[PDB]
């Protein structure tokens, strides 16, 4: 093949090379144009899933994909950290939160997921992988009236996230510091696995041990050209589970959301 | 995993296996219920494309899948053979043609493809893999006003197809007896590759030799749960080509249509 996007990706990657192994040192505002370049390709609806796979699975694309993935995960984390601190210090925390670069995408993503998971008010949700800015947990309660535990493995990040939640005056959202294994001691209707919850294999194998066959489990992943952003959940990762529904993203939303149940 | 379709598919395949033991010759009337059972699975809109490969390509579905695909291709051949002779014998050949089980699907599919391929009246089209009932060729002239060559590898099938065309009074449809390699000797604006043209690898390699980079090429394939019916065209099959458009089927239509151009 001979896709125009091949060269475009290689060119973007060449301008990321000199940041390799040091993407966490990036200036957030300064690198936004790079994210736009990457997302122009990711979000191009004329790229079919077969063509995307052709490009992204090619051995010659491996280093470029690695550069772009490192950039993406580092920019995302830094954007969250920065916004979390801004929200905590703000006189108008909800207005500050609504200005988050990704805020409108999260509203759409969650709308997708609430249909997929048939969320009902008063249901109990657990979200694995909260991060500094636990927006999903927040929305699950604020919009969907669910009762929520957010799980975050890094104690300092967990503490920051609590301050965001409390700053906003949001009720019914608690953060538990721990790994995915903390769900053993919880009772819940819906389990959600962050796009960035890692490592996938260990996480899903642990989840399998705790849930029953009725637990609605939604996990976030990347499909099509959006897989340029981050490594997709693999088939091996979800062994012992059956897929029951998917929402493929549109517009600027990055994640595909997948509903699974523990076998049988 | 633990898909309920697995058992349903295995039971269907058991029935196919038992039937094949007793008869080599298909009983077209008798097997329509089996076809419909298979198509009800194929057409299940609740199963997404990635879930479809998860359930269909699982290693312990190989035997069942191979039986179902053999059934589908053999039934289709026999239905075409039977309808072709019926058309030839009929005092009302168009009315007879329109009773072909799959007829409405062909109209919808061709509409999809005429948009995808920007078909214009008087353009020359080649269709590889005509069959006893060369409906696509017939429609390309009858509806789309194209000048058509239909290619059929089996001389007795090619001969039968010529009689169908003549019975219907359809002009501008010629049948070439030969394999895909006949295209070197033909002028054409658009090339179409039957879903059932085989073998895919050889067919595309030979096409690649004999087309230029401006030639519109549309091939037919099976995606999602419709892959239960027949082996799809792989990305490796189309090495040397780039995808430039895809139409995914709805309703009862089985084929996905893909536009490609030779590189580079
Ligand atoms: N703090 C976050 C977790 C981190 N991000 C999310 C994913 C959010 N994805 C969004 C926002 C943009 C992006 O992730 O690139 C989308 O798909 O458009 C996750 O990992 O699940 C949350 O609360 O959901
Ligand atoms: N004689 C045929 C060729 C054999 N069938 C076609 C495909 C026609 N497909 C239709 C009819 C149903 C089916 O093929 O299962 C559809 O997708 O709904 C081909 O192989 O390309 C023709 O003239 O197109
Ligand atoms: C930045 S958003 C993603 C968050 O998920 C957290 N995380 C990743 N994997 C796990 C896990 N297995 N359990 C709990 N939290 C996790 C990370 O520490 C990060 O803060
Ligand atoms: C029944 S519809 C499909 C038809 O395609 C024909 N066919 C399959 N592969 C090829 C090919 N490579 N070239 C020409 N005709 C083909 C088969 O003989 C069948 O009649
Ligand atoms: Br039966
Ligand atoms: Br008639």
UniProtKB/TrEMBL annotation, chains A, B:
S-adenosyl-L-methionine binds at residues 136, 152-153, 180, 198. One of its GO terms (molecular function) is identical protein binding. InterPro entries: Nicotian_synth (IPR004298), SAM-dependent_MTases_sf (IPR029063). Keywords: S-adenosyl-L-methionine, Transferase. GO terms for biological process: nicotianamine biosynthetic process. Pfam families: NAS. L-glutamate binds at residues 106, 136. It comes from the Archaea. Coiled coil: none annotated. The keyword Transmembrane helix does not apply. This is Methyltransferase.
């Amino acid at each position: 093949s001979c896709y125009i996007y091949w060269d475009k990706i290689k060119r973007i990657a060449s301008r990321l090379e000199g940041m390799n192994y040091h993407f966490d040192e990036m200036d957030t505002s300064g690198v936004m144009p790079l994210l736009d370049e990457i997302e122009e390709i990711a979000h191009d609806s004329t790229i079919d899933f077969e063509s995307a796979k052709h490009i992204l699975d090619d051995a010659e694309m491996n280093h470029a994909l690695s550069l772009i993935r490192k950039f993406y995960v580092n920019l995302g984390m830094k954007l969250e950290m920065e916004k979390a601190q801004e929200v905590i210090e703000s006189d108008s925390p909800w207005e500050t939160l609504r200005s988050f670069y990704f805020y409108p995408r999260y509203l759409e993503l969650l709308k997708n997921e609430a249909a997929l998971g048939r969320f009902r008010r008063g249901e109990r949700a657990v979200f694995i992988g909260g991060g500094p800015l636990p927006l999903t947990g927040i929305l699950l309660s604020h919009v969907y009236g669910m009762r929520v535990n957010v799980v975050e493995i890094e104690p300092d990040i967990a503490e920051l996230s609590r301050k965001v939640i409390e700053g906003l005056g949001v009720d019914g959202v608690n953060v538990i510091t721990g790994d995915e294994t903390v769900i053993d001691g919880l009772e819940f209707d819906v389990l959600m696995v962050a796009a960035l919850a890692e490592p996938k294999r260990r996480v899903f194998r642990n989840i399998h041990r705790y849930v029953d066959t009725e637990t609605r489990i939604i996990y976030r992943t990347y499909t099509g050209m959006r897989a340029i952003l981050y490594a997709p959940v693999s088939d091996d990762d979800i062994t012992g589970f059956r897929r029951a529904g998917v929402v493929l993203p549109s517009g600027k939303v990055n994640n595909t959301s997948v509903l699974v149940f523990k076998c049988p």
